[PDB]
Structure 1
C-alpha cells in the first residue's frame, strides 16, 4: 500500500536527521539525542492493517526501537509493536504473550502521567506494548499483522480507543546515536 503520513518529532535534544524519501522509504541518522520518534505510515490507523516493511539498516548505538507506533483517542492510548531494539528491550507491567508473523511477543502495559502526548504537554494515558522476545532479523521483507496484537490485547482486557490517529513504522530513540533505513508499505 501507499503511505500518506510522515512522523517526525523530537524533544529538542541532540540532532535527528530524518529524511522523508521516495515512496515508502525513509532514513534516520541521529546523535546525542533526547527522545525522538520518526516514521512513515498512514494518517488514519486501523486495527485491521497489515504493515509490511524492510529495514535495510537497523543500527542503533544505544537505546533505539524499530517499532509499529500509533495512537487512539476515546480513550487515549499510545501503542507499540516492537520488532527490534538496541541496548534496551522495553518492558513494563507484564500481561501475557502473543504469536504473530513468525515471532513470539510479550505483552506489557505502562502508564504515563503528566506527560506529553497528542493531547497536550501534560496528560495521562496508558501505553500498550507487544515486544518481540528476540530481535527480529532485518533486511528482508517483514510483516506485522496488527490484528493479531489488537485481539491478544483485548483478551488481556486492553481495549484500544474508537478514534484512530496516525499509525507508522517508526524509529524511536532515547539518549542515543545511530542510523536506520526503512521502507514501509
Structure 2
C-alpha cells in the first residue's frame, strides 16, 4: 500500500488515481490492491480523491465499500471534460448537505432515481487551473454506498436537459469528497466500457 497526502495523479495497481486537497486539516488516501483505496480526514477544508480511469467515457462502473462522513462529504463518480470545461458528478451518497442548484428533471439508473442540477463556479481550481466552468450533477434520491453507475444513462439525460459535455480528455474517478468535515471511506472500483 501507498499513503498519499500531497496533490498528484498517477497509476496504482492498474487504476488511475487523483488526490487534491486545499491543504486544510488532515487528509490522507491509502492506495491498496486493484481498485481499492481508503481515505481518512479530520476537519478538512476541501478535498477530492479516488481511483478510476485516466479518461472518462460511457462505462458501467461497479463499486463497493464504506463511506462515513461526519458532516459534509460526497460519494460520486466524478471527472472533467474539455471544450467545454465541465466538472461532473454522479452522487450516490452525501452527509448533512445535499448538492442542489438549477433543477433540470430526473433520470432513472441502477435501481434509483437521480435529480439533475447545474451550478457554475467562477475562477475556481480545476484540471486547467483557475477557471470558470459549469458543474453537472446527478444526485440519487436515496443514499447508498455501492452498486453499478451506468454513466451513459446520466450523460444522455444531461444532454436531453441541454447540459452538453465536452471531450473526455481528463480522469473519471469513484471519488470521496469532503468540505469542512471529518470521516473515512474504504472503496473498491472496477467497470467496463458500455
Structure 2 counterpart of 1:61: 70
**Structure 2 SS opposite 1:97:** strand
Structure 1 counterpart of 2:17: 6
- 1:95 Cα deviation from its structure 2 partner: 0.6
Match of 2:82 among 60, 69, 73: 73
| Alpha-carbon distance between aligned partners in 2 of 1:151 and 1:20, rounded to the nearest angstrom | 32
- 1:114 Cα deviation from its structure 2 partner: 1.1
Q: How does 1:1-185 map to 2 (within 5 A)?
A: 3-46=14-57, 48-55=58-65, 57-120=66-129, 122-136=130-144, 138=145, 141-185=146-190
Alpha carbon RMSD of aligned pairs, Å?
Answer: 1.1
Cα-to-partner distance string for 1:148-171 (whole Å, 9 max, x where unaligned): 000000000111002421000000
| Alpha-carbon distance between aligned partners in 2 of 1:173 and 1:162, rounded to the nearest angstrom | 27
| Alpha-carbon distance between aligned partners in 1 of 2:179 and 2:14, rounded to the nearest angstrom | 26
Q: Is the 8 A contact 1:3 1:40 kept in 2?
A: no
**Structure 2 SS opposite 1:148:** helix
- 1:77 Cα deviation from its structure 2 partner: 0.3
How many residues in Structure 1 have an aligned counterpart in Structure 2?
A: 178
Cα-to-partner distance string for 1:85-115 (whole Å, 9 max, x where unaligned): 0111111111110000000000000000011
TM-score by length of structure 2 reads 0.89
**Structure 1 SS opposite 2:91:** strand
Q: Is the 8 A contact 2:56 2:168 kept in 1?
A: no
Structure 1's consecutive aligned runs of 4 or more residues displaced over 2 angstroms after TM superposition are none
Cα-to-partner distance string for 1:13-36 (whole Å, 9 max, x where unaligned): 011121111110000010010000
Structure 1 counterpart of 2:8: none
Q: Which runs of 5+ in 2 are unaligned?
A: 1-12
